[PDB]
Design an enzyme around this catalytic site. Structure first.
Site, PDB file in Angstrom:
ATOM      1  N   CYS A 173      33.428  31.298  41.954  1.00 55.29           N
ATOM      2  CA  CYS A 173      31.989  31.444  41.773  1.00 55.29           C
ATOM      3  C   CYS A 173      31.259  30.101  41.832  1.00 55.29           C
ATOM      4  O   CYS A 173      30.028  30.066  41.857  1.00 55.29           O
ATOM      5  CB  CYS A 173      31.691  32.154  40.446  1.00 55.29           C
ATOM      6  SG  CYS A 173      31.864  31.103  38.985  1.00 55.29           S
ATOM      7  N   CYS A 192      37.424  30.292  36.495  1.00 58.31           N
ATOM      8  CA  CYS A 192      36.804  30.649  35.222  1.00 58.31           C
ATOM      9  C   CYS A 192      37.331  32.012  34.773  1.00 58.31           C
ATOM     10  O   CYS A 192      37.809  32.798  35.601  1.00 58.31           O
ATOM     11  CB  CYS A 192      35.272  30.635  35.328  1.00 58.31           C
ATOM     12  SG  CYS A 192      34.536  32.105  36.103  1.00 58.31           S
ATOM     13  N   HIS A 305      42.125  71.292  50.327  1.00 62.68           N
ATOM     14  CA  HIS A 305      41.276  71.920  51.329  1.00 62.68           C
ATOM     15  C   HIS A 305      42.105  72.618  52.410  1.00 62.68           C
ATOM     16  O   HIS A 305      43.335  72.657  52.332  1.00 62.68           O
ATOM     17  CB  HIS A 305      40.353  70.874  51.964  1.00 62.68           C
ATOM     18  CG  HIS A 305      41.065  69.634  52.408  1.00 62.68           C
ATOM     19  ND1 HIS A 305      42.189  69.664  53.207  1.00 62.68           N
ATOM     20  CD2 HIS A 305      40.814  68.327  52.161  1.00 62.68           C
ATOM     21  CE1 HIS A 305      42.598  68.428  53.433  1.00 62.68           C
ATOM     22  NE2 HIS A 305      41.783  67.598  52.809  1.00 62.68           N
ATOM     23  N   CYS A 309      40.886  65.779  56.316  1.00 62.37           N
ATOM     24  CA  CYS A 309      40.324  64.878  55.320  1.00 62.37           C
ATOM     25  C   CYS A 309      39.273  63.999  55.981  1.00 62.37           C
ATOM     26  O   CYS A 309      39.374  63.703  57.173  1.00 62.37           O
ATOM     27  CB  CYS A 309      41.423  63.992  54.721  1.00 62.37           C
ATOM     28  SG  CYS A 309      43.003  64.819  54.374  1.00 62.37           S
ATOM     29  N   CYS A 341      48.355  12.911  23.778  1.00 65.73           N
ATOM     30  CA  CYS A 341      48.155  12.898  22.331  1.00 65.73           C
ATOM     31  C   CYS A 341      46.839  12.242  21.935  1.00 65.73           C
ATOM     32  O   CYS A 341      46.471  11.192  22.458  1.00 65.73           O
ATOM     33  CB  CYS A 341      49.316  12.224  21.617  1.00 65.73           C
ATOM     34  SG  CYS A 341      49.312  12.538  19.851  1.00 65.73           S
TER      35      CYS A 341
HETATM   36 ZN   LIG Z   1      42.887  65.937  52.257  1.00 65.89          ZN
HETATM   37 ZN   LIG Z   2      34.066  31.997  38.426  1.00 57.57          ZN
END
Ligand SMILES: [Zn+2]
Ligand SMILES: [Zn+2]
Ligand SMILES: [Zn+2]
Ligand SMILES: [Zn+2]
Ligand SMILES: [Zn+2]
Ligand SMILES: [Zn+2]
Ligand SMILES: [Zn+2]
Ligand SMILES: [Zn+2]
Length: 375
Positions: A173, A192, A305, A309, A341
């Site tokens: 992003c 992120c 059906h 499809c 450290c």
């Molecule tokens: Zn189907």
């Molecule tokens: Zn991001």
């Protein structure tokens, strides 16, 4: 145009739209369908969250695409997953105890400086101060920091999650967010937490997890680098309970498919079906459990059906890459840091100030817990 809608699934249900179709209206089909307001809803595609106002004619969406819907002062080096009361990722507190007596009385000459020092067992040693205890081993553990916690109330560390102190932009992003997950690939790419959620969820839906033969199912860097498979699978808990649970069932879903079976497409059921023949007509009988009695077409996964499809920019990925002395605040004498450290000990016998590299304050238990070290 026809659009494929995937929400908490592997498959998409078709929605009739066109070039003039706006986004808000489409989440609303889902919003009533799921009783979830569109406003706490997102839909991303091929690495892009296309705004309410963008349409198919103002984007790279073409006919018969398939998309995904989800429902939406202190330096922290450590983040844990808290199994409750939080049930989420929280900033963590580092702690150490005597490997022998399990009391918080183990003193270390040098503090830890890297993740290896605290996850690899028997890596560090010290002296225990507890009465008549010879224990030398250092046992590190993490605790959720979002509320008081017993010392036996430990939480797994999410060790790829880092404080974004360097302010590195997100690989997906390009925003500067905090904290961030930094992969263990070559260039060490940064992402992120929001984009990491969307990444995992998308990969779940598309059944694109990588089977690490040695240990379970995982994902690699989002850029596709080699040698970047996440090894600490608890990182997937960022998905949140439902999705993480779905993630744990991945292997069981894999066996179901390999047994030539098909999954009931109904989300309140989602049974693993192993019918005898491979006929297009499938009835859900629940497998070992009780079925929802749905009769569907094995191919389009719609009601049975008779007829037929019906991702990462190079520039962003170059930007999102993770990669000697200060003067003693009391006595202003330069001193060098021992790696990660933060615990600094000035050698000047007059001054002898112990202080925190990051905070610049006297050394204290809050700085040990929040950031004993950092990466
Ligand atoms: Zn189907
Ligand atoms: Zn991001
Ligand atoms: Zn918690
Ligand atoms: Zn001890
Ligand atoms: Zn990478
Ligand atoms: Zn069913
Ligand atoms: Zn000093
Ligand atoms: Zn500090």
């Amino acid at each position: 145009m026809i659009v494929f809608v995937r929400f908490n699934s592997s498959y998409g249900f078709p929605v009739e739209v066109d070039s003039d179709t706006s986004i808000f209206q489409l989440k609303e089909v889902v919003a009533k369908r799921q009783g979830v307001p569109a406003d706490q809803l997102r839909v991303i595609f091929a690495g892009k969250e296309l705004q309410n106002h963008l349409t198919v004619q103002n984007c790279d969406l073409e006919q018969q695409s398939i998309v995904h819907i989800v429902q939406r002062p202190t330096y922290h080096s450590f983040f844990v997953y808290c199994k409750g009361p939080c049930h989420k990722v929280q900033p963590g507190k580092l702690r150490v105890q005597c490997g022998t007596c399990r009391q918080a009385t183990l003193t270390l000459a040098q503090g830890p400086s890297c993740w290896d020092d605290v996850l690899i067992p028997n890596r560090m040693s010290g002296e225990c101060q507890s009465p008549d205890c010879p224990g030398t081993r250092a046992e590190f553990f993490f605790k959720c920091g979002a509320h008081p916690t017993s010392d036996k109330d430990t939480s797994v560390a999410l060790n790829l999650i880092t404080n974004n102190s360097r302010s590195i932009p997100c690989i997906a992003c390009t925003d500067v967010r905090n904290p961030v997950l930094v992969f263990q690939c070559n260039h060490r790419h940064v992402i992120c937490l929001d984009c990491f959620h969307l990444y995992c969820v998308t990969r779940l839906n598309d059944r694109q997890f990588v089977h690490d033969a040695q240990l379970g199912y995982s994902l690699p860097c989002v850029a596709g680098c080699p040698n970047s498979l996440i090894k600490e699978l608890h990182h997937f808990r960022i998905l949140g309970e439902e999705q993480y649970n779905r993630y744990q069932q991945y292997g069981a879903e894999e066996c179901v498919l390999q047994m030539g079976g098909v999954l009931c497409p109904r989300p309140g059921c989602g049974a693993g079906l192993l019918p005898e023949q491979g006929q297009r007509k499938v009835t859900c009988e629940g497998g070992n459990g009780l079925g929802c009695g749905f009769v569907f077409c094995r191919d389009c996964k719609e009601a049975y059906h008779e007829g037929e499809c019906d991702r990462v920019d190079q520039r962003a990925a170059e930007q999102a890459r993770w990669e000697t002395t200060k003067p003693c605040p009391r006595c202003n004498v330069p001193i060098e840091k021992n790696g990660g450290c933060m615990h600094m000990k000035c050698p000047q016998p007059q001054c002898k100030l112990e202080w925190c590299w990051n905070c610049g304050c006297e050394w204290n238990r809050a700085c040990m817990g929040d950031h004993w070290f950092d990466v």
